[PDB]
Design a protein around this ligand. Sequence first.
Ligand SMILES: Nc1ncnc2c1ncn2[C@@H]1O[C@H](COP(=O)(O)OP(=O)(O)O)[C@@H](O)[C@H]1O
Ligand code: BEF
Ligand SMILES: [Mg+2]
Ligand SMILES: [Mg+2]
Ligand SMILES: [Mg+2]
Ligand SMILES: [Zn+2]
Length: 642
Amino acid sequence: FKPRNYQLELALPAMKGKNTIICAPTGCGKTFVSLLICEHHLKKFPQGQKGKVVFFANQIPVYEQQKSVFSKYFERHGYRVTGISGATAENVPVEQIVENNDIIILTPQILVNNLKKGTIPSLSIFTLMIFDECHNTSKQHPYNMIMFNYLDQKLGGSSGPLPQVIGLTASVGVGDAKNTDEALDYICKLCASLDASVIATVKHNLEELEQVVYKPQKFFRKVESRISDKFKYIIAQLMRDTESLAKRICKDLEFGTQKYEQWIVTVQKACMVFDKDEESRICKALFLYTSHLRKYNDALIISEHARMKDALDYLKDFFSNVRAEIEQDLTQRFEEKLQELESVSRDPSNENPKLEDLCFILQEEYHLNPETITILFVKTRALVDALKNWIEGNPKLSFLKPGILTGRGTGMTLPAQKCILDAFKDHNILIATSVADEGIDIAQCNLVILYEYVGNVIKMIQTRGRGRARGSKCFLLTSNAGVIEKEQINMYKEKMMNDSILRLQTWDEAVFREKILHIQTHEKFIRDSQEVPDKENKKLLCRKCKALACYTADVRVIEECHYTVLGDAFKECFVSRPHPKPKQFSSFEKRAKIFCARCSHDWGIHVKYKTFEIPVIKIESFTLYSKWKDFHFEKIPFDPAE
RNA sequence: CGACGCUAGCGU
RNA sequence: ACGCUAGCGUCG
Ligand SMILES: Nc1ncnc2c1ncn2[C@@H]1O[C@H](COP(=O)(O)OP(=O)(O)O)[C@@H](O)[C@H]1O
Ligand code: BEF
Ligand SMILES: [Mg+2]
Ligand SMILES: [Mg+2]
Ligand SMILES: [Mg+2]
Ligand SMILES: [Zn+2]
């Protein structure tokens, strides 16, 4: 690769030693920029001094790719390149691995753990730190944690040769800024977080850049929601019935929208605090009652954004997971109206006008350009399958050869994700979710459809990375009309972003270097200023059947994070099944998923820790607590001796 | 099992 | 400003 002139331009500040945030559009080759930087940095040292670079990537695919490029590139120059990720994290001398390698590709969460564990004494070991997607440096994110460590050693009395810090991104973001001054403040905060005295962008070479990356034309499609109440009418009855069945027990109480969802979750929270014998029958009934009631609320939301068939099949798939006592009654109410709902799904006149417009868009582009590659973004993983079936089930769309991309959680694994991206060069169109955010550098697309897709200014600028080619088009399809305005804001926010950067770049240096020091200092003492056990024995009950699980005295903590149970008393209370994720995370190894032996509620997982094979539980499956952090009791460290 | 980010809704 | 709920994604 012959370096483009603007790649040198973006590299210039970093090569002169300044801490720099490099802001350039996706696909412009920011990767090769960090190579030029990194190469220049190592060759600046005299014999008897060696530089040590750490490249950060917060996604495994990006991690593996960088380690590949860097290794192939820098092997010739006599620099040893290595990497450490979650799989290679455990049972290795991290300190010596860092010591014996000149360039090190890393996940940030690993450097955080090694700093906290003390295995890595200080960042002074590194002469250079490169943050990829540096806009993630903020809040509690791992990137920011690494910099908190960096900032304390700076502002503290502790003296060390702190590393040069570089960062990379297509956008810094304006945050919540309503204007230039607020936007300029947010960017200044980020610069301080990364200790950057310079924001680098293409200026002199702009004409070259725009012949590489092109800004795809954006279109706003405002449609209308279906007026037909036929489908939601019957289900509104079913939900109205389940409301009575629940009200037929507790007798006390305090819509297919999001507001209604938070209620049913609150109802369940209210039913779990409710003789102890009939109590289990009551709680289990309410749990099963609200569960179906909550999944009926889902079938509504789906019917709005997709076919009625997709919602009916979502229930048809649900009730299949129900079977294999009070469930037989509720499925009876469904089976009763099912015959009627089967016909409503078959009626073409009731078709979603939001889909018809999406169909129309797809017909035009492929009629114009049959070689079109498309990415269709959606919100929920459920809606991913709903549209998959819709395309293959549409005679008009027959030219489409759809494929799916999702995250891990129904979950799609990494090799499953990669398997789709390779066929996307067989696959005509890719239905997906936010996984595409920050980019995997997948196949180029001349068409990008945003289906009820809300996001920030950063994701917006990133998603263009699919449309680098001239003539690429992007559509936004929503019936809400609030989604339109939300995107409009982001467009204005990008303007504020680029205006503020130009305005910041005019400032004399050493004045700005002074301001970031003033931003760092204020942020430090507030960060240091933000910082009672209960020895009583409490009983942990299963949130579903309220059966006895174990006592707080039994529970031990593993490495300050994970909670387990001691004794064979617990072993009679649960069952287990192998879950198809035999991957080792951290010190553990995932083997099977735990279930209630009474019920079948998910308690936690059964793993392998060192020599011992021991279960691990989550409190949110057992007053109620969402996490163990919120649960205050005497924490007994797990002792190998017992 | 845990941590973290984004979006929407809600509350001091 | 934080907190809570859900969706979505990522990492250990
Ligand atoms: N000077 C260059 N000449 C030709 N291709 C380049 C050059 N620099 C980068 N690329 C190509 O850009 C592609 C992706 O760019 P990338 O490094 O991911 O930039 P960004 O991080 O901004 O998205 C790479 O596959 C690479 O082949
Ligand atoms: F590197 Be790109 F901006 F995702
Ligand atoms: Mg990149
Ligand atoms: Mg090694
Ligand atoms: Mg992230
Ligand atoms: Zn149970």
